């Protein structure tokens, strides 16, 4: 969630700020600095993890087309989850 | 090693194209700042003539005496002919630009600039 | 049959809320016509149609006076439009909201913004990267 | 099949036939004649031989190649003689396309041939304006793409592609000023040419 | 130094100068000129206005995307100038009327505008503060507008100490109020150009051996009025500027002059011409010493 | 007050400017199509009081519609010069906004707001009619929200 | 198989029937009134126009408007940085700067569009393979400076928050002719 800082700024979705010191900030005088409230990196942990009784699981985000390419997870290492390189999903073995 | 030539079998032959070229230039002139009302003086106008034409003084080969010739025709046709502007003619002095100092130090200083 | 133009033209003067609805509409969308009310939006516009006008005039919409606080009585913006009205209004569509609703997600925009070019709640740009080189510090005590 | 092209090789032996014609009747002026697979005919000349040729090419009865459809020039900076010159030529009692090339360089010209076709009359000036060629006896001769006082041929492969200068409006002498070239972003280049062959039967040999 | 400021680049319309400057006073004519030398070199200038937006285009592409900030102020509205003078390292006030309106008296512009401004860039933290006033600035005065100027010029000192005060004479361009003024219809003058006088300005706010000290910016040449005023027709209402009018330039002895920023004179004798061509339906003036 | 009367004078001096917009058309390629689209019937850019093309030298506004080339930018500048103030400038399209898909030439001008100064940006390749539209109305409105008389009063 | 234009079949008659008809057309200005009787017709029909603000054009769930930066139902992003959109930028408009980010994920830092350099072809939502970057349906963003027209990953991601009951409506429309 956007955080202020010190000279306050709003901080980004990948912690960009303009240091108290910095002239750039004049832009936003009288003005505002667009940004985006919903956080992807928390958006996707607020999901819960999903169980399979498969110890490999393909992937595609939704429908067919639409989502992403199909890739294949394994779920052999109990001690963590397998999670989706594209959409960031998560699944376990049971 | 032998070559064709193109407009010229000398330089001496050249070099009198060459000051034709200048003849017609330095005449013409003063009619540019007349009619269209240049800031500049005659004498600064003949000075940079003299400047782009001493600018290629080192050339030796007849063909690429002859084509400078001919890019200086086309020009003074342009010129001439009042199809270039008082734009493109102070395009020459460079009125809005500083240069390169011509100084290590003054280079070094600021930039790069080897 | 041209009493009947005439009898068209009244009811079409009538049909609104009397001469203050009547004036009203006329001055700020310079049209009379009569048409049925598809919905509503939660910014107090309204979404017109007729099937037997033309197409490109069967359809139409009647701006809020107030968006987000401004005096949009005569101010006016094609940009008011929120997206699943759009979609109807640039005829993609032959299904309203009302019986088509669009998919319930977060993330998705419950207050519409229009236009802000100029606004203090425009847009300003800058880069999303952090600094890429950092430099030396020296301690603040000497030798 | 339906993802190939067709290939009618009538039109391989009519414009084969017609190479040997044209280059046993000028053994001068010719070399490299060649006929594509995709059925085109090139011939190659000496650049003393254009006139000549264009000649023989429009008003010999056999030939009949009347209409000038392009004249192009070509920059190779590998080969000594760098600018190829192009003329792509047609005919319409044939119903038939010929092309027509011979090559120069810098300070090498070659011969106008407006007295053969009055189209070159523009095409002659914008190689000279684009690659730096120069035309013996042109009536006129001069910039007619870029603007008046450009110096440089810019569609040669060294004149670089976002130019020398740059021009704008500045206040205090109230004109439109040319100035060297800053940009704030610069054009990327984009290395994408593969290491693996696509095509052996170009495969040049060590 | 910020990174922010280090100046990359080779001198151009989209490079970086490192000069981050609010000016006050460009919607005039000096400014016209002050804002251009800084944006063709890559600096980034804040224009505070209080005219309306149409009298401020003509600034918009003097300087390249992104450099020029154009917010709103009123002189009598502080908090106003924090927003201003705050975000950057050099302020320039070029403020000044050749009248006095009902709401603005010559005390106002010369001394107390000034004087808040000082305050508000020492408050922020800027590094250098360049005013401009008149060459003939004097407490003896038949016009009260010089007598303001070398108030505020003090007023000034006693808040910046380490400030640069530019005392130019009457200046000549396009848009002037003295050719097109004496066009529209003793004392000796020494006119100059606006060129060079934004020339040592913008060159001022980089050079280090400028702070605290004066400047008398004066052309190469002298002139009689009546000498004047004829190679003007030859060429070719306000109390207070006709008593400016009627007063000789001094010659400032051993004062910091236009050479010692690095510009050079540029003679009246050649911009003229340009100058007075709008005024139309020769020989020059005899350069004098007393 | 004086300064009701003053906002109802600036109000009807906005009015008419607004409502009286004459544009000259410096149509230079494919951006220009789109304006004769919209003053064709179906967007009727005379119905708000636009005509059609009138002369650059009794004009209001200025539509610059396509590439800048830098054999063509006096000519432009020559033509804003000779325009009458109070005067605007409207720049259609993509090569007009910031050069667009020639930006990286050598015979173009990398935006129209270096020649001259712009007031609205439409963007597009090539913006439809009713984008162009929207942005004509863009420029009615900043005309609304001028306060020139106040400003002479105020000072 | 060729036609003639302006070739008569052969040789006309100089009857005096003829030339009375050719000089009844020549004074009494015959085929004039005509081309005033078109005017009037047309005088007489309805016109195409239609009050802009609230009648809009029509389009197609094809339209190539403003761009937008898509996420997953839960939230997540798609972009993956594999900058296919910008080698197919054919005008060098996009411009885009990549990490791994805190999770460990393939996700953008920086990712900027040029709308003055965009000419609107749709090869970037051609060639994104997930379907995040889409050139939607708006039309209506026109500014007063050039440097809101430089979008970057926070407005494009606001501008799919905003239009994305749209987008996801016209995709589902037409994904099945791509
Ligand atoms: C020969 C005559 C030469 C002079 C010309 C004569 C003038 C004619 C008067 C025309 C006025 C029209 C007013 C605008 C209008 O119709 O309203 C609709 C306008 C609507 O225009 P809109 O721009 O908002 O758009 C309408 C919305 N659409 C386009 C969607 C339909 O109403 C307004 O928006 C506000 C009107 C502001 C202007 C009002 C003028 C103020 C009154 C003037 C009095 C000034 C004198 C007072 C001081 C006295 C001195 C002591
Ligand atoms: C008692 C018996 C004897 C009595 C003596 C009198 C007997 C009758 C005499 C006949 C009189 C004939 C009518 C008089 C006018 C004729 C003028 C005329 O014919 O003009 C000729 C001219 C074209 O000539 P030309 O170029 O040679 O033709 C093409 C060749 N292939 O045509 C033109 O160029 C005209 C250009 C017209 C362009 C504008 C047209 C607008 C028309 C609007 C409708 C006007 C209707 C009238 C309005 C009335 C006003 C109240
Ligand atoms: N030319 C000369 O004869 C000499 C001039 N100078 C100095 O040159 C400087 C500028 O000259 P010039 O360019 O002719 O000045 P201009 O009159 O051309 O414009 C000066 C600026 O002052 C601003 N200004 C004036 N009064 C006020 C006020 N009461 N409140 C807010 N802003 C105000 C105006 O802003 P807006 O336009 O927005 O109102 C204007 O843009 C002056 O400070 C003068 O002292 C010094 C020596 C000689
Ligand atoms: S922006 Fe596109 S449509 Fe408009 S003039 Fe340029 S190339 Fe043509
Ligand atoms: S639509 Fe615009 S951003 Fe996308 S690839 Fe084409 S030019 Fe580039
Ligand atoms: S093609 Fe799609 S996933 Fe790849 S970098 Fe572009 S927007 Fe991101
Ligand atoms: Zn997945």
């Known amino acids: 969630g956007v955080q202020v800082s010190p000279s306050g700024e709003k901080i980004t979705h990948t912690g960009q700020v303009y240091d108290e010191k910095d002239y750039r900030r004049v832009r936003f005088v009288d003005r505002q600095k667009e940004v985006n409230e919903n956080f992807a990196i928390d958006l996707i942990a607020q999901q819960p993890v999903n169980e399979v009784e498969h110890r490999i699981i393909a992937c595609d985000g939704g429908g067919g087309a639409l989502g992403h390419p199909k890739v294949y997870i394994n779920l052999d290492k109990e001690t963590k989850t397998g999670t989706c390189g594209y959409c960031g999903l998560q699944f376990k073995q049971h | 090693t032998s070559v064709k030539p193109i407009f010229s079998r000398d330089l001496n032959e050249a070099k009198r194209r060459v000051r034709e070229l200048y003849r017609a230039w330095y005449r013409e002139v003063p009619n540019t700042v007349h009619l269209m009302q240049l800031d500049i003086t005659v004498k600064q106008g003949r000075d940079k003539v003299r400047e782009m034409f001493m600018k290629n003084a080192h050339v030796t080969d007849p063909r690429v005496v002859d084509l400078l010739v001919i890019k200086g025709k086309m020009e003074l046709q342009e010129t001439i002919k009042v199809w270039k502007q008082r734009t493109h003619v102070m395009r020459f002095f460079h009125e809005t630009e500083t240069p390169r100092p011509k100084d290590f130090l003054s280079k070094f200083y600021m930039g790069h600039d080897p | 049959e041209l009493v009947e133009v005439l009898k068209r033209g009244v009811q079409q003067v009538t049909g609104h809320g009397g001469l203050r609805g009547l004036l009203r509409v006329f001055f700020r969308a310079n049209d009379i016509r009569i048409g049925t009310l598809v919905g509503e939006d939660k910014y107090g516009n309204k979404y017109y149609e007729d099937n037997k006008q033309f197409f490109g005039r069967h359809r139409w919409v009647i701006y809020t006076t107030e968006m987000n606080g401004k005096n949009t009585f005569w101010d006016v913006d094609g940009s008011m439009v929120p997206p699943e009205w759009h979609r109807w209004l640039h005829c993609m569509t032959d299904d309203p909201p009302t019986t088509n609703p669009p998919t319930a997600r977060k993330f998705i925009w419950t207050n519409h913004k229009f236009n802000v070019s100029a606004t203090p709640e425009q847009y300003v740009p800058y880069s999303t990267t952090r600094k890429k080189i950092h430099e030396w510090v020296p301690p603040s005590t000497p030798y | ?206 | 130094l910020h990174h922010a400021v280090i100046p990359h680049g080779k001198g151009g319309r989209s490079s970086v100068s490192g000069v981050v400057a609010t000016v006050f006073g460009a919607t005039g004519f000096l400014g016209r000129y002050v804002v251009n030398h800084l944006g063709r070199m890559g600096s980034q200038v804040i224009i505070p206005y209080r005219c309306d937006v149409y009298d401020i285009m003509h600034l918009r592409l003097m300087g390249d995307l992104g450099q020029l900030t154009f917010l709103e102020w009123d002189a009598r509205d502080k908090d106003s100038i924090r927003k201003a003078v705050q975000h950057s390292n050099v302020v320039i006030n070029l403020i000044g009327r050749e009248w006095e309106t009902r709401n603005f008296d010559f005390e106002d512009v010369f001394v107390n505008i000034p004087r808040a401004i000082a305050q508000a860039s020492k408050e922020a933290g800027v590094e250098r503060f360049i005013h401009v006033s008149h060459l003939n600035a004097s407490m003896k005065s038949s016009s009260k507008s010089l007598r303001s100027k070398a108030v505020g010029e003090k007023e000034v000192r006693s808040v910046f100490p380490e400030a640069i005060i530019i005392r130019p004479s009457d200046i000549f361009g396009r848009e002037d109020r003295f050719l097109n003024h004496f066009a529209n219809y003793k004392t000796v003058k020494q006119p100059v150009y606006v060129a060079d006088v934004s020339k040592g300005i913008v060159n001022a706010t980089k050079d280090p051996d400028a702070v605290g000290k004066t400047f008398a910016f004066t052309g190469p040449n002298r002139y009689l009025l009546f000498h004047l005023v004829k190679y003007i027709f030859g060429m070719t209402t306000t109390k207070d500027k006709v008593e400016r009018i009627h007063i000789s330039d001094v010659m400032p002895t051993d004062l910091p002059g236009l050479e010692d920023l690095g510009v050079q004179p540029t003679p009246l004798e050649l911009k003229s011409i340009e100058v007075l061509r709008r005024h139309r339906t020769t020989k020059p003036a005899k350069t004098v010493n007393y | 007050r004086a300064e009701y009367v003053v906002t109802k004078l600036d109000d009807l001096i906005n009015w008419a400017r607004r409502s009286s917009l004459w544009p000259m058309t410096f149509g230079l390629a494919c951006c220009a199509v789109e304006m004769m689209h919209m003053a064709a019937p179906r967007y009727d850019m005379d119905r708000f009081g636009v005509v059609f093309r009138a002369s650059p030298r009794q004009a209001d506004v200025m539509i610059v519609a396509g590439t800048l080339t830098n054999k063509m930018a006096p000519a432009l500048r020559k033509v804003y010069d000779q325009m009458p103030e109070p005067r605007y400038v409207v720049s259609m399209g993509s090569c007009a906004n910031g050069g667009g898909y020639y930006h990286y030439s050598y015979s173009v001008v990398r935006g129209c707001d270096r020649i001259v100064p712009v007031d609205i940006y439409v963007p597009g390749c090539p913006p439809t009619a009713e984008a162009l539209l929207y942005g004509i109305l863009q420029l009615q409105r900043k005309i609304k929200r001028e306060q020139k008389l106040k400003i002479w009063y105020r000072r | 198989t060729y036609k003639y234009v302006n070739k008569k079949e052969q040789e006309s008659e100089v009857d005096m029937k003829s030339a009375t008809d050719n000089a009844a057309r020549i004074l009494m200005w015959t085929e004039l009134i005509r081309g005033l009787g078109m005017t009037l017709s047309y005088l007489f029909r309805e016109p195409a126009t239609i009050n802009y603000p609230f009648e809009k054009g029509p389009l197609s769930p094809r339209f190539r408007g403003e761009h937008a930066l898509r996420r997953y139902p839960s939230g997540e992003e798609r972009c993956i940085a594999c900058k296919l959109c910008e080698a197919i930028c054919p005008a060098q408009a996009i411009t885009i700067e990549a990490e791994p980010r805190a999770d460990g994920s393939r996700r953008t830092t920086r990712y900027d569009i040029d709308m003055t350099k965009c000419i609107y072809c749709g090869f970037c939502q051609e060639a994104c393979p997930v379907d995040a970057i889409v050139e939607g349906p708006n039309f209506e963003f026109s500014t007063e400076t050039h440097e809101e027209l430089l979008y970057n990953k926070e407005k494009l991601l606001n501008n799919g928050d905003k239009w994305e009951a749209e987008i996801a409506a016209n995709i589902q429309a037409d994904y099945l002719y791509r």
Request: net charge negative; glycine share 2%.
């Open chain 4, 1 to 206: 099949r339906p993802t190939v092209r067709p290939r009618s090789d009538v039109t391989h032996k009519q414009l084969s036939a017609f190479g040997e014609y044209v280059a046993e009747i000028l053994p001068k002026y010719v070399q490299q004649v060649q006929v594509s697979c995709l059925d085109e005919l090139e011939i190659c000349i000496h650049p003393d031989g254009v006139i000549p040729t264009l000649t023989f090419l429009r008003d010999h009865t056999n030939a009949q190649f009347k209409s000038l459809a392009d004249l192009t020039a070509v920059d190779v900076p590998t080969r000594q003689n760098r600018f190829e010159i192009v003329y792509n030529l047609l005919s319409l009692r044939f119903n038939s396309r010929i092309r027509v090339k011979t090559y120069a360089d810098e300070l090498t010209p070659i011969d106008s041939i407006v007295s053969v076709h009055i189209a070159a009359n523009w095409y002659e000036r914008e190689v000279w304006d684009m690659f730096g060629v120069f035309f013996f006896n042109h009536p006129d001769l001069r910039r007619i793409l870029t603007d008046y006082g450009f110096e440089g041929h810019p569609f040669r492969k060294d004149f670089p592609l976002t130019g020398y200068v740059e021009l704008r409006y500045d206040d205090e002498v109230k004109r439109v000023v040319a100035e060297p070239v800053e940009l704030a972003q610069e054009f990327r280049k984009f290395d994408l040419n593969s290491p693996w062959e696509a095509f052996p039967a170009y495969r040049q040999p060590p």
